[PDB]
Amino acid sequence: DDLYRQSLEIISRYLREQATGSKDSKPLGEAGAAGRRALETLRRVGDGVQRNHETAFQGMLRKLDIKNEDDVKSLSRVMIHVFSDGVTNWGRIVTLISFGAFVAKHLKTINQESCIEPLAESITDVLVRTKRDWLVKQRGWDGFVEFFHVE
Amino acid sequence: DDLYRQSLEIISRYLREQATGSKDSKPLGEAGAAGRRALETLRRVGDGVQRNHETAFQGMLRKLDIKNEDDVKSLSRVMIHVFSDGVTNWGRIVTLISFGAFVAKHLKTINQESCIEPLAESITDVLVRTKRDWLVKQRGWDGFVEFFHV
């Protein structure tokens, strides 16, 4: 499942660097150039979403009270509910990833960095395994980069 | 103080329309040309700010615990703090007016409509009485309309 592996690599890398505050120079292994531009786009757009909704996100995280690995399945349930109206678009997708990055920052703060990888896999699972055909029709991460292109 | 009267009229009308949910056709009285387009712009931009920050605003309103007329002056204190870095721009101003409308909606919900006018006056007081020179340099509400032109 190349699409899952590529997607996990991008989302995992973004959540990791957000939680640590450091952009890893390690090259993308399973993303093939398109992933590099996607991560670059996700940094710009994902960071802006977090700045726009930081206080809202804090309240959501508090209500969810995610403290360990078995709580990540609540973010999975939330994402399923988001898409339950049958609508899919990149704004929704990148808002969920950005909330994921916000949660990862919190997990690192409370010495729960081990939960960041399972969090990323949970997010990628919903995206790729329930929205596969839509992603493929958008040409995957290339469509993501094009959609958020800055003039 | 024409600038105060013009500004109060715009902000008062917007807060009241939001609280009741009904766009009044009553013409603006002391706002001239800029006033008509300003309320139109404030409706578009202000409604979008509230959509963008509804949940954050709800939490803010909860922490402030505004229940009656004495509590209304806390928004003016919040506005003073917002501008304490010496920076002024229309995004800040409209975000504060939009939160004011969000509060006005709440006041109506708890049968405190009498507090909406004092809230509008407190907002207008901070804007006009502490940022007068900046407003005049921006060409007042005409600059507001141009800045947010679509």
């Binding site: 929704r92 808002t95 959609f147 | -």
Partner: peptide, 23 residues
């Protein structure tokens, strides 16, 4: 559930954000 309410908030935010790039 709190999860359903949080989802509605994230969906709304997502759609507002999508619209600034779609046009």
């Amino acid at each position: 559930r709190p999860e359903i309410r949080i989802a509605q908030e994230l969906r709304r935010x997502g759609d507002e954000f999508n619209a600034t790039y779609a046009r």
